[PDB]
Design a binder for this molecule. Structure first.
Ligand SMILES: CCCCCCCCCCCCCCCCCC(=O)OC[C@H](COP(=O)([O-])OCC(O)COP(=O)([O-])OC[C@@H](COC(=O)CCCCCCCCCCCCCCCCC)OC(=O)CCCCCCCCCCCCCCCCC)OC(=O)CCCCCCCCCCCCCCCCC
Ligand SMILES: CCCCCCCCCCCCCCCCCC(=O)OC[C@H](COP(=O)([O-])OCC[N+](C)(C)C)OC(=O)CCCCCCCCCCCCCCCCC
Ligand SMILES: CCCCCCCCCCCCCCCCCC(=O)OC[C@H](COP(=O)([O-])OCC[N+](C)(C)C)OC(=O)CCCCCCCCCCCCCCCCC
Ligand SMILES: CCCCCCCCCCCCCCCCCC(=O)OC[C@H](COP(=O)([O-])OCC[N+](C)(C)C)OC(=O)CCCCCCCCCCCCCCCCC
Ligand SMILES: CCCCCCCCCCCCCCCCCC(=O)OC[C@H](COP(=O)(O)OCCN)OC(=O)CCCCCCCCCCCCCCCCC
Ligand SMILES: CCCCCCCCCCCCCCCCCC(=O)OC[C@H](COP(=O)(O)OCCN)OC(=O)CCCCCCCCCCCCCCCCC
Ligand SMILES: CCCCCCCCCCCCCCCCCC(=O)OC[C@H](COP(=O)(O)OCCN)OC(=O)CCCCCCCCCCCCCCCCC
Ligand SMILES: CCCCCCCCCCCCCCCCCC(=O)OC[C@H](COP(=O)(O)OCCN)OC(=O)CCCCCCCCCCCCCCCCC
Ligand SMILES: CCCCCCCCCCCCCCCCCC(=O)OC[C@H](COP(=O)(O)OCCN)OC(=O)CCCCCCCCCCCCCCCCC
Lengths: 114, 313, 96, 110, 98, 167, 80, 347, 70, 105
């Protein structure tokens, strides 16, 4: 049959979000609050096109908007967020229910400053 | 590093089985208005060592077996299944953190009747074979209420994960919402491991035809199963407080509760006469099994009528 | 007690699932770039290995349709070392 | 992999202790003798009742095998159907025990 | 197809030819029949898990339960034969030649 | 060697079947079927069917083969067996050697010689197991299947008590 | 109807307890007010990704942000 | 047996056949066959003698082997098609295995070696159930997979069943073994026309069920299980000899009787399809069936074998057996040939 | 008297204390001073392998936070 | 006979387990959902005799999605040629197929 079409290695380069899983799970709810629109354009494009090759560019917008999410944490509230994701990172199941007061301090700092 | 973890599991299992014999003889001593062994060690602490060194240099019985291979494989399967029941136990962290550790323990305890069956068939005495068939029928009888009580309890847990069963009991012991299942569970674990008032292998037992070494191996597999089922009942009904930053609070707490429950086994074997065989078959098939089915229906329909269905994860 | 605490556990489970739902577009995009990276690397190594073979078409799909087919485990890890193969194909099953 | 290492370690310790227990007093020399049981040489009479309790176990164990996905099945969205079929399986297990009762099947192993 | 399917099908054929060629006992025939069932269980399970076909995960359990019930029925027949002749030998079952 | 592990387990599976299809005695045959059930459970467990492999233990081995060994112990108490065993083992090793020297074979169907790790999926199923959810759907979706299985088990109890009565 | 009940509670208390617990387990989910909340919780537990919709222009009941007012609400689950 | 338990068990047999008929899923086909076997086992062990236990053991072994081959065919269909619909099979290995499994369930030759044994071991009402109701499920499964059946395999099974069921009944004096070899030959006739026109397969199945039920109902009413016991019927009740005469002349395909109705229509659907040799061999082989039917009519109806003295006592008592539908079955199994184009109701 | 049994019970209790305490110490040793990551579900394993790939030392327990991104 | 009671009474006894493309719990897709959807929507209503020869492309793509015969044959081909070139010494594996390149995400 036909030759399969794959994008080049230069097309797939983007600045990666090089953080751990607990760093993501700690800031997950503020990410879902603040990075709604490019993520939903991407997942709508991903369920409609049914092809990752048609969803590269929108995917980069995801990886463009997550980093702008984290820089704005790194500028303002890097210490309460680090103190929070470390406590999330200790647990094996990574519970939220073990870490409510660092969550309260981080959400206080986010609500005030951002 | 992990082999160190397996050995630090299974060597203190064997030492706890060793000193369980001393604890049993001392507690049955004082409950019978006498003393247990206190001559050999200081307060008797060298009695299991003396017992083991005596048994391992006793002459073999040198019997004629119908099969060499099953006569060898019955203590092998006995020790293997008796030691691998310990590995999913969350105390506070299990050796093998598996998703279906409850079902693992139920299946491996169901496989332990092949040791009774093979070690009774391997003896040439047909009366020993009758004793083995009666003991296997006893054990597979009480496995039914093991399975159904275990299912009815884990309807309030959410999954077959043993470690989630601590997170379940952060607010109450699970003996409070399910005490009839708890008391039938305790008697059913008492009748699995051939423990009094259900030890009809004392009366010809199935393993009266083995040497003193292999009889010590069957005996220590039996006691590993006793300590294990008491730890499993402790985790499953009497679950302790768990601090993720100080795990030894959970370890000391479930240890004290499991010791009190094993001492309760010892305190039950020194209190009651033995059931007759049809009387414990009457206890299972006509008393424990109707209540177990009724409470199974109640614990199916109970989280639905209360809107208290536990999470899967 | 189990009524209150299982209702609380359902609320906590819904919270963790919403964390996963907030994270899924990023992880999906990274997974897409991951598998397209691996297929492009496998395509270039197929183009530099399958040169002597007569009548060979590099990157010829085995399907008649032009639709995207989800790549198999041997399509991504077919040309890598045994450690990456074992870690990717039995990692979650053999994890404890 | 850690599980297979654990199983192999437990089987190795079991095999090593069985090898010790069968072969450490073979170093002893002690003696030999003749060494020729309530029943002497009569063959085992077949008791039908032990077979009946074995098959009754097997049938109720298959019914338990059906009942095992109930903690997972409680999470469903078709809860009226799920509750009906759960109570129906436990009711048919009860009907199996009632028929096992009233036909004197649980007798002399009651 | 896959390589494991060759071994599971060859296991089914081995247990078939064991079940199709009796030696002496009826119990050995029932054991070969349950080995056939075991190989069918493993083969159905590998297909249903391999394809991620979700609803057929309740299929092998059914394939277990019925067939295991079948085995119970077979054991009962064996016992009845062993209550007539004293052994479970398949050469005792030859009255229906006449 | 390790990437072929499921294949390796399947080899032991077939070896175990020649253990009891040769029919040495019903008790060694039951032992061979127990070992076969253990390694076939290992085959199932290495795909992610944890519940189904534990049903092989709990219900097949620990539930039914107990009753086989139990009935056999109370209802029973060569060179053909050995020749059958070596013939089955040699046919299995010829199959192994063919499909390992060719990476492709065709006995009745065409079989690849690579490891069966290649045919897996490169995705995750989230916060469940797909196999556990497909078994949980026995009560919500599988109503008729539960009805006919419960009726067959009730009738199984009835039929066993009728035919073991002798009257 | 009651002398029989005292009779069977004297002779076989285990079976009276068994049929009473099974009878409650059958009839009592139909009588409880909280059986509705079991379904309302078990459908509100999001195992899947809530795949968004293409905004044509007439969906006033579908939000465009998770913190919009319109859409399904789980304040009943917090309050109960 | 308790009459309630007998009713529940016969409803379980019927429910198993209905689940084989009405279901669109292969696992439910297999469940229906398992349920049918599991419930028919007490009907065979109704009288509790060693011959019924041997017949039940042989029936269990053959039907269990057949059900395992059936599940292997279903599983290979799941391999090569990924689906469970009860329709054509997507692999000739699955087609061969399912045709073999259904042949073992029908007792078609060379898998016929259980049918004259098991029918001899069990009572006449249980033999009636085995030879009539137990053919309805596998002929339905063969009816639904006929785009997949290899023509050579099913025709080999058909003609081999006809010849072996022809030569089998010539040596038999037991009535149940005669009816069993008659069963094998008529199953060969039903499967021979299956891939050409399966409406004639259903027609032969219905006419066969009517004639076999007539003969077993006459045997039950007269309590005759051997040839020589059937020979005493003229002195006990003479109308039964006329009925076994007309029914055995029906079953041999003799016109104007309705047992000529299937095979003629079968020939009528095979000479359409350029097959002249095969229905000619089938027709010539059916004369063996007609020969041992004529043997039974010579022993029962057309002569008077000598009876015993004690038959004089049995003159003084009427038959009180519930001969259910015996006049209806005897009319329908003889006088139905003028209504031959009724077969279109089976289309 | 009855307190004579407490040495044997104490030795048995120490032997029951050893496996869980030791496996807690070994889990905290092998995982960067933290608990072992519990991966019962496929998503937890995907996040764990993503940690292993972003750590840069092929150990999932090296947590990279905001100091890693710009 | 196929007495279609389920279509007559309108009940759904067992159509739900019948195909992979049917409704699954928690919307879990099968690995060949698109291929079987194309094969069934090709072959619906046109009868089996037309469906065996007019839907051959869809069914062959779906069958090769099922068993992966052509894909594993192609992987045998590429791996065999690669191993021959490594044995001859004419090819080297790259750094990313030796496991030394700090993977993507
Ligand atoms: C459609 C297919 C229908 C198939 C037949 C269904 C019924 C028969 C099967 C069940 C059975 O055994 O029933 C007993 C059966 C008689 O069986 P038996 O014991 O062998 O009969 C011998 C003597 O009749 C015993 O006599 P008795 O003295 O003991 O009792 C007198 C009895 C008293 O009757 C009553 O009491 C009946 C009143 C109650 C009826 C139900 C009420 C609820 O009257 C009769 O029995 C008269 C004969 C009835 C006809 C029998 C044959 C029926 C037709 C069979 C199919 C014909 C198809 C021809 C096709 C031709 C072309 C191919 O039937 C009846 O008793 C009543 C038959 C009613 C027929 C209704 C037809 C229309 C349906 C719409
Ligand atoms: C797990 C943690 C620890 C658990 C407890 C451990 C300490 C207790 C140990 C005590 C010593 C046990 C030694 C062995 C005992 C063996 C004897 C034995 O168990 O016999 C069982 C006996 C058997 O009965 P029996 O033989 O004594 O009586 C005669 C019975 N017939 C007539 C049949 C011959 O009792 C039971 O089976 C009862 C089981 C538990 C019942 C639970 C009932 C719960 C309440 C239900 C509802 C009631 C109210 C009414 C309805 C209300 C509705 C709103
Ligand atoms: C850890 C749990 C406990 C493990 C087992 C106990 C630990 C110590 C094991 C070795 C104990 C000593 C050897 C076994 C007992 C010997 C008793 C005996 O009668 O020996 C005489 C026997 C033979 O004595 P004999 O030649 O007079 O034979 C007596 C029999 N007649 C007279 C009929 C010929 O000695 C031996 O067989 C020697 C065995 C090994 C000795 C120790 C070697 C080093 C071990 C370290
Ligand atoms: C005796 C049997 C009693 C229980 C019967 C089923 C009760 C029930 O709620 O069924 C709804 C269930 C399910 O209905 P449902 O409303 O959940 O269907 C919606 C579709 N799904 C499940 C995909 C979301 O079953 C049926 O509707 C049909 C199956 C049962 C049909 C009756 C069988 C009778 C057998 C007699 C012999
Ligand atoms: C995790 C915890 C597990 C704990 C397990 C162990 C529990 C028991 C702990 C020990 C209890 C006390 C033991 C005391 C032994 C007897 C000491 C003694 O005095 O023995 C005297 C004996 C003969 O001496 P003699 O020279 O004849 O004296 C004449 C004097 N004019 O001299 C002798 O017999 C020689 C000396 C023998 C000493 C034996 C000591 C016991 C060994 C037990 C093995 C296990 C030890 C602990 C292992 C775990 C910790 C590393
Ligand atoms: C007479 C012979 C000798 C007798 C003595 C020795 C044999 C008997 C005693 C040993 C019994 C062995 C039991 C092995 C399987 C136990 C079940 C099991 O593995 O369950 C654990 C787990 C499922 O849990 P889950 O968390 O869902 O999976 C991990 C994904 N998160 O699953 C996993 O973690 C899967 C891990 C990978 C797969 C492991 C497969 C191992 C090989 C199979 C068994 C080998 C032994 C065969 C013979 C047994 C005899 C009965
Ligand atoms: C509708 C919901 C679902 C109901 C079914 C679910 C049941 C769950 C529990 C499983 C029970 C399975 C086994 C039951 C067997 C019953 C038959 C029986 O045991 O009868 C015999 C018994 C007398 O025993 P006997 O034969 O003498 O034995 C010798 C030593 N006892 O006879 C007796 O003891 C008399 C038994 C009958 C009278 C019991 C009355 C109980 C009343 C409870 C409160 C009201 C419940 C209302 C529900 C409907 C009741 C019909
Ligand atoms: C040609 C068809 C068979 C193909 C496989 C042949 C394997 C080798 C066996 C050859 C025949 C050996 C033999 O004597 O078989 C007869 C034996 C039953 O006879 P028995 O009563 O034990 O001994 C008296 C003589 N018949 O029968 C048996 O013991 C049969 C046991 C068969 C188990 C099959 C094992 C695997 C064989 C290879 C794969 C198929
Ligand atoms: C497209 C096809 C779809 C399906 C269409 C319908 C197919 C119908 C197939 C009929 C098969 C009949 C099977 C046998 C009868 C079933 C009921 C039964 O079990 O009757 C036996 C019963 C047992 O009585 P018992 O007392 O045990 O006998 C020993 C002596 N005391 O009682 C007796 O022994 C009493 C003696 C007389 C019994 C006569 C029963 C005749 C039933 C068949 C009638 C003819 C067939 C229907 C019309 C044609 C349909 C194709």
């Amino acid at each position: 049959p036909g030759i399969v079409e794959l994008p080049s290695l230069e097309d797939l380069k983007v600045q990666e979000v090089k953080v751990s899983s607990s760093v993501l799970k700690a800031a997950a709810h503020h990410y879902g609050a603040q990075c709604d629109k490019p993520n939903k354009e991407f997942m709508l494009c991903r369920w409609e096109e049914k092809d990752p090759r048609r969803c590269l560019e929108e995917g980069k917008l995801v990886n463009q908007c997550a980093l702008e999410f984290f820089r704005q944490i790194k500028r303002h509230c890097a210490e309460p967020f680090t103190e929070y994701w470390t406590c999330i990172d200790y647990s094996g199941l990574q519970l939220f229910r073990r870490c409510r007061k660092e969550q309260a301090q981080f959400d206080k700092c986010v609500l005030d400053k951002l | 590093m992990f082999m160190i973890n397996v050995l630090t599991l299974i060597i203190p299992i064997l030492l706890a089985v060793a000193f369980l014999t001393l604890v049993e003889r001392k507690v049955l001593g004082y409950m019978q208005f006498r003393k247990g062994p206190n001559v050999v060690g200081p307060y008797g602490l060298l009695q299991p060592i003396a017992d083991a060194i005596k048994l391992f240099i006793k002459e073999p019985l040198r019997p004629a077996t119908s099969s060499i291979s099953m006569f060898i494989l019955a203590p092998i399967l006995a020790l293997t299944l008796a030691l691998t029941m310990w590995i999913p136990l969350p105390m506070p962290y299990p050796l093998i953190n598996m998703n279906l550790g409850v079902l693992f323990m139920l299946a491996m305890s169901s496989l332990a009747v092949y040791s009774i069956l093979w070690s009774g068939w391997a003896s040439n005495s047909k009366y020993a074979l009758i004793g083995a068939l009666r003991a296997v029928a006893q054990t597979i009888s009480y496995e039914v209420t093991l399975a159904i009580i275990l299912l009815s309890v884990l309807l309030m847990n959410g999954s077959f994960t043993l470690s989630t069963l601590i997170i379940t009991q952060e607010q109450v012991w699970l003996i409070f919402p399910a005490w009839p299942l708890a008391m039938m569970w305790f008697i059913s674990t008492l009748a699995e491991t051939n423990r009094a008032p259900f030890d009809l292998t004392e009366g010809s037992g199935f393993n009266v035809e083995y040497a003193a070494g292999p009889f010590a191996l069957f005996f220590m597999a039996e006691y590993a199963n006793i300590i294990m089922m008491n730890i499993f009942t402790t985790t499953l009904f009497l679950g302790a407080f768990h601090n993720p930053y100080m795990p030894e609070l959970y370890t000391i707490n479930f240890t004290i509760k499991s010791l009190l429950l094993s001492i309760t086994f010892l305190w039950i074997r020194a209190s009651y006469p033995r059931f007759r065989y049809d009387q414990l078959m009457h206890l299972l098939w006509k008393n424990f099994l109707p209540l177990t089915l009724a409470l199974c229906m109640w614990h199916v329909s109970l989280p639905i009528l209360l809107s208290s269905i536990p999470p899967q994860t | 007690s189990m009524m209150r605490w299982n209702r609380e556990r359902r609320r906590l489970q819904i919270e963790d699932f919403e964390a996963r739902i907030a994270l899924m577009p990023l992880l999906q995009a990274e997974k897409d770039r991951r598998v397209l990276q691996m297929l492009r690397e496998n395509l270039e190594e197929e183009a530099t290995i399958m040169k002597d073979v007569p009548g060979w078409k590099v990157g010829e799909s085995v399907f008649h349709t032009t639709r995207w087919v989800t790549p198999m485990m041997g399509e991504l890890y077919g040309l890598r070392t045994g450690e990456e193969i074992l870690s990717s194909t039995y990692g979650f099953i053999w994890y404890t | 992999m850690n599980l297979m290492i654990t199983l192999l370690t437990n089987f190795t310790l079991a095999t090593l202790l069985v090898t010790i227990a069968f072969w450490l007093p073979q170093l002893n020399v002690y003696s030999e003798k003749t060494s020729p049981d309530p029943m002497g040489s009569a063959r085992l009479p077949f008791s039908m009742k032990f077979f009946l309790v074995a098959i009754t176990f097997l049938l109720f164990d298959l019914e338990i095998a059906l009942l095992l996905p109930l903690p997972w099945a409680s999470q469903t969205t078709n809860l009226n159907t799920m509750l009906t079929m759960a109570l129906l399986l436990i009711f048919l297990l009860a009907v199996s025990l009632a028929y096992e009762w009233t036909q004197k099947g649980l007798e002399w192993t009651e | 197809m896959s390589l494991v399917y060759m071994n599971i099908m060859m296991a089914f054929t081995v247990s078939l030819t064991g079940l199709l060629m009796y030696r002496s006992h009826l119990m050995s025939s029932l054991l070969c029949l349950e080995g056939m069932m075991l190989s069918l269980f493993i083969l159905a399970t590998l297909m249903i898990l391999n394809s991620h076909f979700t609803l057929a995960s309740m299929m092998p359990i059914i394939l277990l339960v019925f067939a295991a019930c079948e085995a119970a029925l077979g054991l009962s027949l064996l016992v009845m034969v062993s209550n007539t002749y004293g052994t479970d030998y398949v050469q005792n079952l030859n009255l229906l030649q006449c | 060697m390790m990437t072929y592990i499921v294949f390796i387990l399947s080899i032991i599976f077939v070896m175990g079947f020649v253990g009891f299809s040769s029919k040495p005695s019903p008790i060694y045959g039951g032992l061979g079927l127990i070992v076969s059930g253990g390694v076939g459970c290992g085959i199932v467990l290495n795909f992610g069917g944890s519940f189904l492999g534990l049903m092989v233990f709990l219900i097949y081995l620990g539930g039914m083969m107990v009753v086989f060994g139990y009935t056999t112990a109370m209802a029973t108490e060569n060179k053909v067996v050995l020749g059958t065993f070596i013939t089955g083992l040699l046919m299995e090793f010829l199959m192994v050697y063919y499909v390992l020297k060719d990476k492709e074979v065709e006995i009745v169907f065409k079989f690849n010689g690579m490891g069966d790790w290649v045919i897996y999926d490169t995705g995750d199923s989230g916060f469940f197991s797909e196999e556990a959810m497909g078994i949980a759907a026995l009560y919500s979706y599988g109503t008729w299947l539960v009805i006919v299985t419960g009726w067959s088990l009730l009738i199984g109890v009835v039929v066993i008590m009728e035919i073991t009565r002798g009257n | 109807v009651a002398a029989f009940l005292k009779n069977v509670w004297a002779k076989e208390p285990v079976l009276v307890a068994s049929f009473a617990i099974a009878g409650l387990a059958v009839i009592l989910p139909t009588l409880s007010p909280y059986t509705k909340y079991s379904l309302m919780i078990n459908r509100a537990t999001p195992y899947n990704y809530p795949v968004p919709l293409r905004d044509d222009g007439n969906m006033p009941d579908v939000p465009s942000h998770p913190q919009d007012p319109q859409g399904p609400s789980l304040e009943w689950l917090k309050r109960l | 047996m308790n009459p309630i338990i007998l009713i529940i068990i016969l409803m379980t047999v019927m429910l198993g056949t209905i689940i084989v008929m009405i279901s669109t899923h292969w696992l439910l086909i297999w469940i229906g066959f398992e349920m049918n076997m599991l419930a028919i086992i007490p009907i065979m062990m109704k009288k509790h003698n060693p011959r019924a236990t041997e017949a039940s053991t042989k029936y269990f072994l053959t039907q269990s082997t057949a059900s395992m081959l059936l599940m292997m065919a279903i599983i290979i269909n799941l391999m090569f098609s990924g689906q469970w619909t009860v329709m054509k099979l997507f692999n000739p290995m699955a087609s061969m295995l399912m045709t073999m499994a259904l042949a073992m369930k029908l007792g078609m030759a060379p898998f016929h070696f259980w049918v004259p044994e098991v029918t001899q071991g069990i009572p006449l009402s249980s033999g009636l159930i085995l030879l009539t109701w137990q053919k309805l499920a596998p002929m339905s499964v063969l009816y639904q997979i006929l785009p997949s059946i290899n023509l050579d395999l099913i025709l080999t099974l058909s003609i081999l069943s006809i010849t072996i069921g022809g030569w089998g009944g010539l040596n038999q004096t037991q009535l149940r073994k005669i009816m069993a070899y008659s069963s094998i030959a008529h199953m060969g006739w039903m499967t021979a026309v299956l891939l050409y026109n399966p409406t004639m397969t259903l027609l032969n199945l219905i006419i066969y069920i009517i004639m076999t039920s007539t003969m077993f109902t006459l045997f039950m009413a007269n309590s005759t299980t051997t040839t020589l016991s059937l020979s005493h019927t003229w002195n006990k009740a003479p109308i039964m000899t006329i009925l076994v005469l007309i029914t055995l002349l029906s079953m041999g395909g003799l016109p104007p009787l309705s047992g000529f109705m299937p095979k003629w229509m079968i020939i009528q659907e095979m000479t359409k399809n350029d097959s002249i040799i095969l229905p000619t061999l089938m027709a010539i082989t059916a004369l063996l069936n007609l020969y041992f039917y004529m043997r039974l009519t010579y022993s029962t109806a057309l002569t008077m074998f000598p009876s015993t003295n004690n038959m004089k006592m049995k003159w003084q008592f009427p038959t009180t057996k519930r001969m259910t539908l015996l006049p209806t079955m005897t009319v329908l199994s003889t006088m139905l040939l003028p209504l031959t184009p009724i077969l279109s109701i089976l289309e | 008297m009855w307190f004579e049994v407490l040495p044997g019970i104490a030795v048995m209790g120490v032997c029951l204390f050893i496996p869980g305490m030791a496996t807690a110490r070994i889990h905290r040793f092998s995982n960067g001073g933290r608990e072992k990551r519990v991966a019962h579900y496929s998503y937890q394993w995907y996040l764990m392998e993503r940690d292993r790939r972003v750590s840069g030392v092929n150990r999932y327990y090296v947590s990279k936070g905001l100091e890693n991104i710009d | 006979p196929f007495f279609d009671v389920q279509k007559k009474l309108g009940v759904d006894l067992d159509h739900w387990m019948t195909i992979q493309s049917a409704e699954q719990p928690h919307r879990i897709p099968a690995r060949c959902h698109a291929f079987e959807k194309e094969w069934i929507e090709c072959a619906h209503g046109i009868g089996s005799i037309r469906a065996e020869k007019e839907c051959k492309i869809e069914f062959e793509d779906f069958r090769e999605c099922l068993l992966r015969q052509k894909t594993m044959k192609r992987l045998n081909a590429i791996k065999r040629q690669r191993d021959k070139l490594i044995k001859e010494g004419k090819y080297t594996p790259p750094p990313h197929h030796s496991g030394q390149e700090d993977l993507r995400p």
